[PDB]
Amino acid sequence: GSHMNPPPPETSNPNKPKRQTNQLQYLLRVVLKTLWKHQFAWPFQQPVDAVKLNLPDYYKIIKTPMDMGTIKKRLENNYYWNAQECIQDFNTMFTNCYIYNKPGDDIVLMAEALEKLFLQKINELPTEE
Numbered sequence: 001g002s003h004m005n006p007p008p009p010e011t012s013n014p015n016k017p018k019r020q021t022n023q024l025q026y027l028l029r030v031v032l033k034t035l036w037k038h039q040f041a042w043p044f045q046q047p048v049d050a051v052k053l054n055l056p057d058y059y060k061i062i063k064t065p066m067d068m069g070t071i072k073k074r075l076e077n078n079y080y081w082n083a084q085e086c087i088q089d090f091n092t093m094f095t096n097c098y099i100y101n102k103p104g105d106d107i108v109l110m111a112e113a114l115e116k117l118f119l120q121k122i123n124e125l126p127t128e129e
């Protein structure tokens with residue numbers, strides 16, 4: 001990994017309290033699963049590598065980066081305390097794309113397709129038991 005990309009978001013921290021919830025289980029088993037296999041997932045499956053993409057201003061603009069590879073690791077190595085934290089990561093990922101890129105750009109259309117799917121699934125986020 002290039003020194004000119006930031007370190008990725010935190011995925012492991014023993015000091016942060018962790019909990020499994022049914023909602024977090026749904027986020028992994030249903031939401032992440034659904035979005036990961038989408039035809040348009042690939043740009044979002046890992047941190048933006050601004051060096052390889054020749055976007056030297058990316059991390060000048062995007063100060064709260066997030067991606068589904070990070071979210072997958074956070075879900076699989078349960079990082080979260082609640083589903084809101086994970087939903088916020090997805091929302092951050094989409095908003096980064098919409099802030100950095102022009103409306104109607106391919107990457108935006110791809111993000112918008114994943115977000116539509118995401119919204120459908122989050123509307124069915126089960127009641128916390």
Ligand SMILES: O=C1Cc2ccc(Br)cc2N1
Pocket residue numbers: 043044048053096097100101107
């Ligand atoms: O917004 C972003 C993230 C990203 C992922 C993939 C490609 Br190609 C371009 C970009 N720019």
